[PDB]
Amino acid sequence: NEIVLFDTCYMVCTYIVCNSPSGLKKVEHFFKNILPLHFGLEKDKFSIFLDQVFRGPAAAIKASLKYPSHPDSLLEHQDHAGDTENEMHDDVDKEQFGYSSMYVFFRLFNLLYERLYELQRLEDQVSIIQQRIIPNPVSQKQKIWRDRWNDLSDVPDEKTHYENTYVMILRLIYGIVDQSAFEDYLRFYYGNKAYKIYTIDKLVWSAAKQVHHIVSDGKYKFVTSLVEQNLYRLEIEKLLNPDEILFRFCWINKFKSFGIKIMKRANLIVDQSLDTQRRVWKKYVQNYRIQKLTEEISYKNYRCPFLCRNIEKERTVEQLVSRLQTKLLRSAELVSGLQAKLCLDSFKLLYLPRTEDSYIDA
């Protein structure tokens, strides 16, 4: 739903520009360069839709508070056009790498999107509840009927109930109408079925806090530069952070899908019983984890034992493993392995004299 997506982005940027004058240039930079890199939205048209409120019409927009006008469809794609039955192939158009501070932001963005979407989907329940609350002629004749419309404040007049509720959300965000009036509007129109919008203010505040942290945290310029500079696995698992997790973000355009995967997680704290644990646990992981990054303790020295220029340059690191698999399914005589079962000393890696390894490749 492009409408709901633009509304979510507009809400976060509006909250930032209203409640936080500081860091305004940096938040423009973020919302204008980093987020489109992950969402594949159209650059210039997203720019127009955002500076529709980012630069003037704070008191002017505070007074006006109109519904943000939406442009036409926003779609960006590379040289991949065409779709047929039985071959509706897909591709990870944009693949980025990130950390916890951005993972939380995407999760909050998704929460906000889901709740605005569910809010839009109650248009028929609006009329059902309005029919439910209807005066009784006997009560009117007995002079005991107190209408409920005379309690609402100035209600906006847009085309859609969703737009009216959106203007009300913006009013709460800016700080005009209080929580009581907002909840009373929600109860008059949506009954007791819109109970998830009540904490939309806290949700937007958390999203803006994560945006500010992303853009101005301890390694802010470093991570933003290593993101915006432009095949990045050993170009992304080198830096150090306070025990974070590495994430892979993928965007598919033919389906409008967004995928979050967990890559290697940074190492935990070392222990003293590892000397006795290695006898059973360590070798199990190190051997059964065939060609996969073992993660017990690795921070100290990881001088990459091969230059990155030797590997053939390629995009979409997911297919590098396919290249390796195709290579492995080739002329290699490929004797099994060294068969080095010695840990009785538990201080070093030892081998057996026989059990060489043959022509590993070809």
Partner: protein, 386 residues
């Protein structure tokens, strides 16, 4: 911290194993009975076409325990396909008298000169000596020649490429000895001793004769010096023909590029490759950096001009080329290494004691480590396809 180091080496070996296909085009790893000390190919081989392969001969020096040293011959079966593959050892000649290094006469296929940690000088073994040696002989093999004059255990040995029976041996006692075999006797070793170079007060590190001249001898000495001189003068026993302070850290290795009479090169502890010419012995023709720790031994490619491999103690080994020096380097890739950095190798678990190039099979490098690892490897033709 020791277990942390062990786990680091384990992790780097694992990642290197996984990425082996992209890296190499031939990898043959074989374990041994005890940590080796040296290895050198043979300039000859045999070709077996009934299956399509080639048998290579190898001389190896491996020690079981303290004192007992094993000299052995390996056969490397490798395919003739690129436009079971396997090595097998034999003849584990035992020697309670330590013989740490060995070198075969480029002329006599069996005249092998060996140097050790107890003997102050060299011992030369021959085919008739091997054959006379019985299996049930618990006593070691008697070397046909016992070239012994010095006092402290000798360090480096080198035969000449242009002359028969002409050897040089640099010892621990800050001396060098040039030996001639044309005037050999049974009770007089001073006679076979051609020249006695007592010129540097410090012990020499490496010795080598020139490839295109019978009389030029170069040697690097622990005083961070490189002296090249001539055997024919008697004044060479007192002073070298030309000696230069090469580096700052203790000098380690030196060589010529046998394809070019002018390329001399050396390596020391300051993480540097120093290249020099026979014209300007005053200034270093070129300085090369990029290592991480102390280097041990360097050698050019005995089949091609610009290639130079260098070992180290940081559990790596690199292959540089000279022809690409001065060429540009795009920034997006330059961050990994200097532009003359060509290839790297990190597939071991310890230091790389000894290395060699298989003579007639270019880009084929044999190396040995302390975990009894013996790898015959060869990089991808793609990384150097010209």
């Amino acid at each position: 911290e020791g277990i942390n180091q062990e786990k680091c080496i384990n992790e780097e070996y694992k990642i290197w194993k996984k990425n082996s296909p992209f890296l190499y085009d031939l990898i043959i790893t074989r374990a041994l009975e005890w940590p080796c000390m040296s290895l050198q190919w043979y300039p000859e081989q045999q070709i077996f076409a009934e299956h399509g392969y080639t048998e290579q001969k190898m001389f190896l020096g491996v020690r079981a325990d303290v004192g007992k040293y094993l000299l052995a011959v390996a056969s490397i079966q490798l395919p003739y396909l690129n436009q079971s593959l396997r090595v097998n050892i034999s003849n584990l000649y035992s020697h309670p008298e330590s013989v740490c290094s060995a070198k075969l006469m480029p002329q006599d296929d069996s005249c092998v000169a060996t140097v050790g940690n107890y003997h102050n000088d060299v011992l030369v073994f021959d085919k008739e000596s091997f054959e006379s040696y019985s299996s049930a002989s618990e006593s070691p093999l008697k070397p046909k020649y016992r070239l012994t004059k010095h006092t402290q255990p000798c360090t480096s040995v080198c035969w000449n490429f242009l002359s028969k029976g002409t050897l040089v041996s640099g010892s621990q006692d800050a001396t060098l000895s040039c030996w001639d075999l044309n005037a050999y006797n049974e009770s007089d070793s001073a006679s076979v001793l051609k020249v006695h170079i007592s010129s540097h007060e410090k012990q020499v590190s490496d010795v080598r004769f020139h490839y295109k001249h019978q009389d030029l001898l170069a040697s690097v000495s622990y005083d961070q010096y490189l002296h090249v001189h001539d055997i024919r003068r008697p004044d060479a026993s007192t002073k070298p023909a030309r000696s230069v302070h090469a580096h700052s850290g203790p000098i380690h290795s030196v060589a010529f590029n046998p394809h070019n009479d002018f390329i001399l090169a050396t390596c020391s502890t300051d993480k540097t490759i120093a290249l020099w010419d026979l014209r300007n012995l005053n200034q270093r023709l070129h300085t090369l950096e990029g290592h991480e720790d102390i280097v041990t031994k360097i050698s050019f490619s005995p089949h091609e001009e610009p290639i130079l491999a260098s070992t180290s103690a940081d559990r790596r080994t690199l292959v540089w080329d000279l022809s690409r020096i001065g060429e540009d380097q795009p920034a997006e890739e330059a961050q990994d290494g200097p532009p003359e950095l060509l290839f790297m190798h990190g597939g071991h678990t310890s230091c790389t004691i000894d290395m060699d190039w298989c003579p007639n099979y270019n880009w084929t490098m044999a190396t040995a480590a302390e975990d009894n690892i013996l790898q015959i490897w060869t990089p991808s033709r793609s990384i150097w396809g010209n």
